[PDB]
């Protein structure tokens, strides 16, 4: 009940694998009556982990570590795994039963309607395939998860209704539909047909500030919307940015991979300093991400063209040809301390929107998709 005090169901030490730096560390966990699963560095006598076990899927495994268990949940259209280890099979069973008990207490379109044309991405949890709806001839990206990912029928129905309720957010790939077969969960989403921004930057080598400002503005707008609904994108990078047919930005939702890395040696991804430090991270990682993308757009290369050390300790250098305002924007977005970073304060995207670099931007025209694009992608077929 909501009026009742939140109470501890089960508590104790667990070994947990890091989210981004995939290394084992001992943590003290409290499973709460409201579904919070809260992790501290030491036993309380400021939590480092806090997520919900509501709607989760629990699995036993013996490899790599014996007495390992995985809490898997679906976050929007993306599988999130959290991996834990205890010292015996009996201890694991007690944890799994506790977690499951708490999760229990809180409780036509087919695949033959599509032509399957081309692979768009793959990863450990499934694949994204370019599809054509047969009856309409309209193209979509179908993100198909592997059979191992079991999700409840009420949870998929919730995501479909919640996608429909939110229909102004023009620069995100909209979820069109989601459905289950006998075995698999499929998400039908919009496909941007203007190509990869990674490709366009490679083709052109570098963008002008004007063009970079245009794409930056659209990203800033998209991030303002997500952050206003308490959503961190986490993966702002060139590979996750596409253009639609008109040349406007689409941020993608094609994640199928496990997050993170074994250690700092095996990274090239520019994770936020606070992520690398293994600290409290939040919405400020997206402003870092924007910093790195805009640096790439305007300079034609990543900041450190040893990367763990360089991100933590070394200052990002600017070409002399960058304007003072561009230099200032990038310096602000690439501050190592997320409290000092442009966008890291209470006003969030407003700080970025008010920066000298963006003074020519009409932000009403941005969100209404009314700023005219400086580049129109060449008109391709959908398969090409
Ligand atoms: C508020 C608008 C609707 N909406 C919700 O209601 C609930 O949460 C949402 N989450 C995401 C979203 C999607 C992937 C990510 C990731 N990179 C981080 C990750 C590992 O989880 C994949 C992070 C967040 C999105 C989204 C969809 C398309 C493009 C960008 C973001 C939309 C919503």
Residue numbers in the entry: -1 to 43, 50 to 111, 146 to 205, 208 to 307, 314 to 351, 357 to 435
Sentences from the paper on this structure:
The serine/threonine protein kinase AKT plays a pivotal role within the PI3K pathway in regulating cellular proliferation and apoptotic cellular functions, and AKT hyper-activation via gene amplification and/or mutation has been implicated in multiple human malignancies. AKT is a serine/threonine kinase which plays a key role in the phosphatidylinositol-3-kinase (PI3K)/AKT/mammalian target of rapamycin (mTOR) signalling pathway and is involved in cell signalling, proliferation, glucose metabolism and protein synthesis via phosphorylation of two critical residues, threonine 308 and serine 4731,2. Small molecule AKT inhibitors are typically either ATP competitive or allosteric with respect to their binding site. Allosteric inhibitors induce a conformational change through binding to the pleckstrin homology (PH) domain, thus preventing localisation of AKT to the plasma membrane and therefore inhibiting activation of the pathway.
We present the discovery and development of ALM301, a novel, allosteric, sub-type selective inhibitor of AKT1/2. The allosteric binding mode of this series was confirmed via a high resolution (2.32 Å) co-crystal structure obtained with a close analogue of ALM301 (compound 3) in complex with AKT2. Compound 3 binds in an allosteric binding pocket ca. 10 Å away from the hinge backbone (dark blue) at the interface of the N- and C-lobes of the kinase and PH domains, similar to previously published allosteric AKT inhibitors. The crystal structure showed compound 3 binding to a DFG-out conformation of AKT2, restricting access to the ATP binding site. ALM301 adopted a similar binding mode to compound 3 when docked into the compound 3 binding site. The bicyclic moiety of ALM301 was predicted to stack against Trp80 with the carbonyl group close to the Arg209 sidechain but not forming a direct hydrogen bond. The unsubstituted phenyl ring occupies the hydrophobic pocked under the DFG loop that would be occupied by Phe294 when the protein adopts a DFG-in conformation. The docked pose places the para-substituted phenyl pointing towards the catalytic subunit, with the polar substituents both forming interactions with the protein; the basic nitrogen forms a salt bridge with Asp275, and the hydroxyl a hydrogen bond with the Glu299 sidechain. ALM301 binds in an allosteric pocket created by the combined movement of the PH domain and the catalytic domain, resulting in a DFG out conformation. Incubating ALM301 with increasing concentrations of ATP had no effect on the biochemical IC50 value versus AKT1, confirming that the mode of binding for ALM301 is allosteric and independent of ATP concentration.
